[PDB]
Amino acid sequence: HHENLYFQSSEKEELFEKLKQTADEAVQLFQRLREIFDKGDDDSFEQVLEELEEALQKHRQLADQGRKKGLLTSEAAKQGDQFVQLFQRFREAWDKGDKDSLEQILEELEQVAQKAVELGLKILKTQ
């Protein structure tokens, strides 16, 4: 029989801890990606880019899991869609060698990332 995750305090807490753990790893990788980009190490850049893509995908799957189990769709979903779309453009600029678009998108990604940190952690307090 079905019960909303909202009312399963023990299982919901475990999901929320995994959400914060994967967010923390993705945010750490995003900050290292910025530092590597400034240093200009290609191999290190591509490595951290793949690790960040994998960490972001795991974070987003956990968010989808909570919503499938009953939680309402929060404003963090749409704001995270904005980050994912910009992040895919960033990766596509790197694939194509468009360093012009790369640096411009990265500045915009830094602002969207800070909003995602603030919005996601605020919303989690009352989900």
Task: Give the interface segment with Cl ion, choosing from 1-9, 10-18, 66-74, 101-109 (CB under 5 A).
Answer: 66-74
Min CB(100)–Cl ion separation in Å? 34
**Closest of 118, 31, 25, 34 to residue 76, by C-alpha:** 118
Does position 74 bind Cl ion by CB under 5 A?
A: yes
Task: Please name which of 36, 62, 63 lies closest in space to residue 49, comparing C-alpha atoms.
Answer: 36
Query: Residue 26 CB, nearest distance to Cl ion (Å)?
Result: 16
Q: Which x/- pattern, by CB under 5 A, does the window 20-59 give for Cl ion?
A: ----------------------------------------
Cβ 62 to Cl ion shortest distance, Å? 10
**Is the dihedral angle over the CA atoms 20, 77, 103, 57 positive or is it negative?**
positive
**Residue 22: both structure tokens together:** 């994967």
Q: Where are the alpha helices (DSSP H) in 5-126?
A: 9-39, 42-68, 75-96, 99-124
Which residue bears the tokens 């290190």? 44
Minimum distance of Cl ion from residue 65's CB (angstroms): 11
Among 77, 117, 119, 124, which residue sits at the site for Cl ion (rule: CB under 5 A)?
A: 77
Which stretches of the chain bind Cl ion, using CB under 5 A? Answer: 74, 76-77
